[PDB]
Amino acid sequence: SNFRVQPTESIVRFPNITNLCPFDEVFNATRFASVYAWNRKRISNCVADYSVLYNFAPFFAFKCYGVSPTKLNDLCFTNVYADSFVIRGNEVSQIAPGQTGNIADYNYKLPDDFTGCVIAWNSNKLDSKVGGNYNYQYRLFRKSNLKPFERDISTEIYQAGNKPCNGVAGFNCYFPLRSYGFRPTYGVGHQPYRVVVLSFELLHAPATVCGPKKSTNLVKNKCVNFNFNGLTGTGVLTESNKKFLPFQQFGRDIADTTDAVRDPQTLEILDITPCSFGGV
Amino acid sequence: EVQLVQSGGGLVKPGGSLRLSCAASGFSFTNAWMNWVRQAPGKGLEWVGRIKSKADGGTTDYAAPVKGKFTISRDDSKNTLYLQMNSLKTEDTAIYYCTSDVYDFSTGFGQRDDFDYWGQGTLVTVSS
Amino acid sequence: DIVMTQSPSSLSASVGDRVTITCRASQSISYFLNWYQQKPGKAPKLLISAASSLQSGVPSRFSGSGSGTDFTLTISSLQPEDFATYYCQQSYSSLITFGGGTKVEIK
DSSP states (O other): OEEEOOOOOEEEEOOOOOOBOOHHHHHSOSOOOBGGGOEEEEEOSEEOOGGGGGGSSOOSEEEEESSOGGGGGGOOOSEEEEEEEEEESGGGGGSSTTOOSHIIIIIOOOOTTOOEEEEEEEOTTTSOOSSOBOSOEEEOOOSSOOOTTOOOOOOOOEEOSSSOOTTOOBTTEEOSEEEOOBOTTSOTTTSEEEEEEEEEEOSSSOOOEEOSOOOOOOOOSSEEEEEETTEEEEEEEEEOOOOOOSSOOEEEOTTOOEEEEEOTTTOOEEEEEOOOEEEO | OOEEEEEOOOEEOTTOOEEEEEEEESSOSTTSEEEEEEEOTTSOEEEEEEEOOGGGTOOEEEOSTTTTTEEEEEETTTTEEEEEEOSOOGGGOEEEEEEEEOOOTTTSOOOSSSOOOBOOOEEEEEOO | OOOEEEEOSSOBOOTTOOEEEEEEESSOOTTOEEEEEEOTTSOOEEEEETTTEEOTTSOTTEEEEEETTEEEEEESSOOGGGOSEEEEEEOSSSSOBOOOOEEOBOO
16 A cells, blocks of 8 residues: 555634625615626625525525535635626526526626526515516617626617617617516516526635635644645645745646645745655 | 606696696606606695506506596607596696606616606696 | 505604604505605605615715515704605505605794
């Protein structure tokens, strides 16, 4: 067999951040934007506690692409983008990477490389009128499909055929937007659903959002498990002589393996050396 | 500037008919719902009816006391809204306002059933 | 139709005072409630939309809150130009009904 050294301690180094991310105002909002003009909010420089997310209704969908919900408290993303809107029931399947349809093409398109989470919950008791909730509209006609995360709020009359419209609707000249008719008596596939899309991006720049993972003391010259801003690994941390430029955070080897890391708190450089190992 | 000039108000005998007009300017009349609201002398506001935009089907809703007597019409050509009332009684006297339900297509948070802009109001009196 | 009641209907206060107007609906109307201000001899003006959103051009001293069957309009610091009649209007149903009307006067 092959002998290896086993770790003795586990250390976590997270940024010294106290503020709590404003997920309550994103989720417990009085109104949600229309799908064609979905509301985008930037979340950064705060501690993101997702353990409270489930505290807003019995989630109908919590599909996470690239990560898992149970692990969301152990990661350190860089920027969070929260896009909130309202759609219908059967249309909720269109909010996913590599999808097609009315919402995917003309309202909200998710890139194929999407990494994040999608939340949808039924909101028939909030966004339905017995006479019809006409506050929510979706685009029905466009020249071409949308680029990922592109918002189209134009309301110009759509010209389909060769006949000019001159700004007057009618045959061959349809109004681009069509309004939802949410009612309390509609079917589940037609009832309103509130959708919040979180778009994480990892690595690169220093992480500004992090989970509620406590940071322990930093120990060097020992074979330990380490977790630097979501970067997990095993090895021995040692002082570095590297000319790490101020912006540079971590260094890579020939095999693109993290070999030097900048401590998120002390802003000091640490070389990572794999624990002694070999064959017998 | 958004303006809603009204005309056609006046006095009428019981059982008569008048044709109120409300000409809109300064905004896209096509995309805005138009509602009629009346205020009895010394009383609170009462809702008369509503006509939706042509892009939403143009269905017309009326209050219970005025369902079978009033008729709300619109013409996008001259950006004008019309309220036709017939078979009046002594209880229909009030100051009638024409109101709009402009929808903000840009921001996204645009209400559709809020009286954003109001006309100056015209006085309609029913007497012998 | 939905029965809609205001409370109170004769409240008065002086300048630099806090005023709260309560508006109760006969059934759950979610957030479809609007607050209007009518000065004597003038057309009404929209103040609060969706029962929690300030309208553009309205001073920040007007605030809306509540949901379900209870709504409240709060004026933090009353002003000489804030004496008027306030109406709460529901849009949950197709038959829109206004409130009873609250008159805010001076002492």
